[PDB]
Amino acid sequence: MTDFLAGIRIVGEDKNGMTNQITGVISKFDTNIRTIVLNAKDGIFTCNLMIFVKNTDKLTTLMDKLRKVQGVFTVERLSNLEHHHHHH
Amino acid sequence: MTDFLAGIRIVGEDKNGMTNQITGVISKFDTNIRTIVLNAKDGIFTCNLMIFVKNTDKLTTLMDKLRKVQGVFTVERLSNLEHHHHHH
């Protein structure tokens, strides 16, 4: 009701540590991770975070928390989700 | 000096914190996350870890580290991978 499944997408440079620190920061959030897909390809990584929030302001707040990492250049919201029968 | 892309499959009960702690433990490893995919289905969640390891012993050790979690009941190795990693 007040809660909904919110989505985030993080694209940053694939360094020996960034992929670890990024999802680490995510795992220590206030909310519970129901889905997350990070893949480092070619030289960049895209970490798609899926968590439940009480409001949109909560979602925009997480963005700023992720933008604290200098290695990341894109922190964006996922309006259209990948959540349906058969996920891969 | 060997090093291969090792995959791991973790299935545990979707609890208030498990999904967070599980990937949080993963970030603590001596290896860089190349791909991580966590998703909950029906009261359960499956997290797939994709990382690099020098030796198969280094990989079996990661299992034992993940198997320390009471909320998890399956910790397996992903042999058949969709990771077409080549040069053109």
From TrEMBL, chains A, B:
ACT domain residues: 7-80
Protein known as: GTP pyrophosphokinase
Task of the protein: In eubacteria ppGpp (guanosine 3'-diphosphate 5'-diphosphate) is a mediator of the stringent response that coordinates a variety of cellular activities in response to changes in nutritional abundance.
Family membership noted in the UniProt record: Belongs to the relA/spoT family.
Taxonomic lineage from the root: Bacteria, Pseudomonadati, Chlorobiota, Chlorobiia, Chlorobiales
